[model samples]
Target: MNKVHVSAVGTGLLKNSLSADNVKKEVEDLGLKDWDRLKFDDDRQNKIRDNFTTLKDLLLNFLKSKGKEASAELDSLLSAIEKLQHKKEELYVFLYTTNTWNSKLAGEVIKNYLEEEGIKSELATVKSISSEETFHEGIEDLFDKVIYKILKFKEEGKEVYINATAGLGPETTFLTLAGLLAGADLVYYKYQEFNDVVFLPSPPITISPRYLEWLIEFANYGYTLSEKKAEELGIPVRLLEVRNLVERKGEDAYRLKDWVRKMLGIYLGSEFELE
Candidate 1:
């Protein structure tokens, strides 16, 4: 098997590298707040880049101060390697990060550290899901780019695993499901305070055909709908919210949760043999 692993990356490494007060003092010391006033393609920009480089070096030093185990990603990854009984060289890893500046920076640092340890790895960034209106698009981007890699690996008869110990809670939950549905071998998660890495075996779950029609119609539009439009479409807004199928995007909008999009997207694609 090809032995592919996807690890969700977050700012946890950077966040944990320094304490709350020190982080604040360090940023102030670095003057990153002036990042906006600096223009690109100028010496000012170079200075800002130098500031980031310094911060990166600081993060690396701090991360290494305690050892690789200080990183949630590395800790879970090492445990995964041990649990899977595979050598570090035998696995190909993708450090997946969200589309945020901090996430990308942290992911880059992690990738550098991983390669230094002789682990082959690359960084993958999904679109920003920071806004309610873009949740669907972000999840779709994640599925199209990263999750489908798992499916393709499975089709090639490769072993795939997910390190979901990092990233935002909601995104990681969907990632776990998507990996399972994409035929990953295992999903690993470790609580920040816990030494044990938990291996999550996928459950046998699929979207119900009973909701197929409504879901198809719902999928035709954006993942979120205005409250009045949702009612007009015969959707039970409150019921869906109560059932965890949808969430309040704002006062007047409701958005489908990532799991709904993940499962529904898979189900629809399979039923229609879509690309």
Candidate 2:
């Protein structure tokens, strides 16, 4: 038998507080004056509120475009997939439902569709941590579950192919990294311009081995350390010349370079950047 096909099914309703629907819900629940601005300053507050207004319009339009078949995104994708010819075996679709009916409905619909395709498949749901609109913790939980399955399937000699066409856009960044780190045979995304998937070139996974502990300590201490202490903690002292990771300070004190701090800020999930 060939490698079993495994795909992570990302449901559309993953966005909670970050969603446009949530903004409308919040406005309806709490008067617009009382709606929390998520701690944003005046400028950012206005920007996000306006952005949510547009998202709300887009979401409502999409729902109207495909009524009742709420999982229409999956339907479009699977229809494309079912026609593909491959040296395949069993197909396993992993669903991240997170206790939402929307996710469950999508799961059931996709499962039924796959069943009707004459493909032996299994539909399994990941036990979510929190159904709330937390981005970091939720993705970590989802990542752990999907990466676990990826590693297990690979151990049994089954090639894992992650389907990253659905869900929010940021999901692609996290899932692709986690999948590649956990040994997925192929990590890919769907392109609307075509009926198939596009595999990404493997990125440089050369993370510093010792910097993990250093990162935790650095974060705990507010990104400050003595120069000697940094070397003692196995920090790459050689990078001081380039100063991208860590820069020398006056006398003995040392602090992370601005770029490194930004990178760490992002890795710790305290920051976000649009590409």
Which candidate has the highest lDDT of all?
A: 1
- Name the lDDT of candidate 2: 0.50
Off by over 4 Å in 2: 1-84, 124-133, 202-229, 236-275
lDDT of 2 by residue, 38-65 (tens): 2223343453345454434443444444
The Cα error of candidate 1 at residue 111, in Å, is 0.7
lDDT of 1 by residue, 1-275 (tens): 27777887766666566554555467656654443233223354454345667666766766666676757888888777777787775778878876555666678778877777777888888887757777778878888778777777777888888888876678888878777877788787777677677877667455555565556666667778887898788887788888888889878888777656656656555334233
Clash pairs (backbone) in predicted model 1: none
lDDT of 1: 0.71
Evaluate model 1: give its TM-score.
0.69
lDDT of each: 0.71, 0.50
- All candidates: CA RMSD in angstroms? 6.8, 11.3
